[PDB]
Amino acid sequence: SHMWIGVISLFPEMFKAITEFGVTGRAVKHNLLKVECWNPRDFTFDKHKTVDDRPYGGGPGMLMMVQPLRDAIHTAKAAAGEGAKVIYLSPQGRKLDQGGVTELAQNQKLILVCGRYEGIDERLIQTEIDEEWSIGDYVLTGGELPAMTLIDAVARFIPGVLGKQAEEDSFADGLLDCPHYTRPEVLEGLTVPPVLMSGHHEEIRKWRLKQSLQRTWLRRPELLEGLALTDEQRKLLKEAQAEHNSLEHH
Amino acid sequence: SHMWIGVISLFPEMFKAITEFGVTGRAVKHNLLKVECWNPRDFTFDKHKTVDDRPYGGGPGMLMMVQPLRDAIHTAKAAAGEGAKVIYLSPQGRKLDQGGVTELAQNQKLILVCGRYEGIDERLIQTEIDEEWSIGDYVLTGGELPAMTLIDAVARFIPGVLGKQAEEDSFADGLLDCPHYTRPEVLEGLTVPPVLMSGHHEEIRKWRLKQSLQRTWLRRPELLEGLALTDEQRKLLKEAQAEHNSLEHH
Numbered sequence: 001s002h003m004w005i006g007v008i009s010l011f012p013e014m015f016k017a018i019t020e021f022g023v024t025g026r027a028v029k030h031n032l033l034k035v036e037c038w039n040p041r042d043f044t045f046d047k048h049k050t051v052d053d054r055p056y057g058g059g060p061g062m063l064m065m066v067q068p069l070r071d072a073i074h075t076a077k078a079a080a081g082e083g084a085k086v087i088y089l090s091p092q093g094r095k096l097d098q099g100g101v102t103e104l105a106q107n108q109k110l111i112l113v114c115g116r117y118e119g120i121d122e123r124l125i126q127t128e129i130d131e132e133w134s135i136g137d138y139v140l141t142g143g144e145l146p147a148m149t150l151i152d153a154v155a156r157f158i159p160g161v162l163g164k165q166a167e168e169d170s171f172a173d174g175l176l177d178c179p180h181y182t183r184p185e186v187l188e189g190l191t192v193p194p195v196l197m198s199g200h201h202e203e204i205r206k207w208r209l210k211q212s213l214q215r216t217w218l219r220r221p222e223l224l225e226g227l228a229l230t231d232e233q234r235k236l237l238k239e240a241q242a243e244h245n246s247l248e249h250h
Numbered sequence: 251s252h253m254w255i256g257v258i259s260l261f262p263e264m265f266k267a268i269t270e271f272g273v274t275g276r277a278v279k280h281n282l283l284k285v286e287c288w289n290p291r292d293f294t295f296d297k298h299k300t301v302d303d304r305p306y307g308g309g310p311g312m313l314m315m316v317q318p319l320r321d322a323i324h325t326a327k328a329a330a331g332e333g334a335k336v337i338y339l340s341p342q343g344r345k346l347d348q349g350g351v352t353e354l355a356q357n358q359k360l361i362l363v364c365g366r367y368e369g370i371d372e373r374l375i376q377t378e379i380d381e382e383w384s385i386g387d388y389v390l391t392g393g394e395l396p397a398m399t400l401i402d403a404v405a406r407f408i409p410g411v412l413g414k415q416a417e418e419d420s421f422a423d424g425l426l427d428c429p430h431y432t433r434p435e436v437l438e439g440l441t442v443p444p445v446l447m448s449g450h451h452e453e454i455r456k457w458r459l460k461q462s463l464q465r466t467w468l469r470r471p472e473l474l475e476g477l478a479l480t481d482e483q484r485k486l487l488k489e490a491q492a493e494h495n496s497l498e499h500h
């Protein structure tokens with residue numbers, strides 16, 4: 001085992017999406033990744049298990065009820081033992097990116113608090129949360145999907161998780177990935193770049209790095225401006241741009 | 251019914267995460283949102299239902315097998331009838347944001363192609379995809395979570411989906427949301443801003459807009475620079491900054 005993740009959520013079963021399918025399901029099944037959930041609903045005392053409450057100053061929407069949510073978080077922290085980083089999923093937190101992913105991957109223990117409705121009391125955040133994280137500048141119905149997004153992302157780093165089907169993928173080296181092809185040789189009248197059929201290992205390597213650089217330049221120029229390229233990368237980028245400026249475009 | 255979403259995925263059951271829980275589950279259960287899936291595996295012809303293949307030029311990783319994936323996509327398009335926008339979930343696509351969400355919400359029909367492994371043949375993308383979308387600058391194990399992220403986001407716009415527990419949330423007006431409080435009056439020694447207890451509707455309104463502006467200014471200044479504030483917003487932003495510059499900080 002390498003990573004334990006505690007989760008606070010009103011919809012615990014949603015997490016089977018990552019715990020029972022694909023490489024993440026595999027990682028969980030083989031104890032490389034542990035995911036335990038605590039539902040605030042189970043900590044309610046009223047006959048109707050109320051997990052929401054009215055915000056002071058009213059307004060539209062409801063907030064998660066404090067007591068049930070706080071008790072679930074404390075219970076989760078009790079099981080986590082010491083060293084767990086408590087994270088609140090929020091569109092107002094640090095926007096996630098590969099760098100943030102690798103940073104989060106360093107933790108051995110995590111606790112992810114998933115909100116619902118309008119969110120949670122701001123005092124809870126100040127007193128129970130270590131960091132706030134967002135998966136992007138958009139709003140979802142709850143923290144569950146974002147929490148799973150975070151888990152899936154950091155799971156790719158746990159040793160033994162990925163197989164023969166990672167270090168070449170987008171943002172890995174700060175660059176987008178190159179295009180890839182497979183059978184058939186001709187698809188809808190389109191062929192595979194001859195070099196990928198030539199079997200020239202070194203040439204194929206350069207073609208891929210060149211494409212990785214060109215695509216980053218064309219789609220995410222700001223990324224290039226941020227990276228410090230090696231001599232070879234600066235040479236392949238020059239060639240990729242030169243090749244592009246040599247052809248007609250749409 | 252208002253939106254039909256066709257999905258191509260090797261793990262169809264993952265989608266129960268959104269189709270059977272919360273407001274999205276509710277929206278599906280009540281036919282406001284329709285989600286149909288097609289698994290490429292069901293289109294395989296070999297004894298072992300192979301859905302992956304070796305990339306030309308080799309390298310690490312596998313690609314989704316073309317024929318099974320292409321047949322699933324065509325079948326999905328056949329059911330979609332005409333007018334469906336075909337989307338490929340990819341970390342190299344247009345980065346998602348609220349604006350993009352509202353744009354995507356205009357479509358009545360969507361088809362979301364979820365990749366696995368290293369991805370899919372670049373020719374398939376050129377011949378079957380209308381647009382590529384990313385949920386953020388990080389890499390996940392598959393397109394399923396990103397696809398669900400997209401669905402959940404656009405579902406918030408379908409009429410009848412959200413209830414009394416949306417227009418006040420972050421990015422709605424381009425600004426982050428304000429803090430919110432609920433019972434108890436005192437939490438861990440922390441009290442609720444008196445104004446939220448005063449019951450002064452107009453004052454509470456300004457407090458919320460001011461906080462929304464201050465938080466955006468402090469956390470996402472670039473967003474402010476992009477927005478065109480109204481007179482009242484420019485006045486409340488001035489006050490929020492002035493109030494902040496009047497206190498000690500950590």
Ligand SMILES: Nc1ncnc2c1ncn2[C@@H]1O[C@H](CSCC[C@H](N)C(=O)O)[C@@H](O)[C@H]1O
Pocket residue numbers: 088089090091092113114115116117118119120133134135136137138139140141142143144146418419420426427
């Ligand atoms: N972009 C995203 N990243 C992480 N969590 C998100 C998210 N979008 C929504 N959430 C989660 O889903 C919940 C319901 S959305 C309510 C959001 C809140 N009023 C705001 O504007 O800050 C939030 O409490 C949060 O836990």
Ligand SMILES: Nc1ncnc2c1ncn2[C@@H]1O[C@H](CSCC[C@H](N)C(=O)O)[C@@H](O)[C@H]1O
Pocket residue numbers: 168169170176177338339340341342363364365366367368369370383384385386387388389390391392393394396
């Ligand atoms: N940020 C994200 N947004 C949308 N889809 C993503 C994603 N991260 C991963 N994927 C999805 O999961 C799949 C496995 S990840 C393989 C990614 C590919 N080599 C690249 O670098 O472009 C991708 O095919 C895609 O469908």
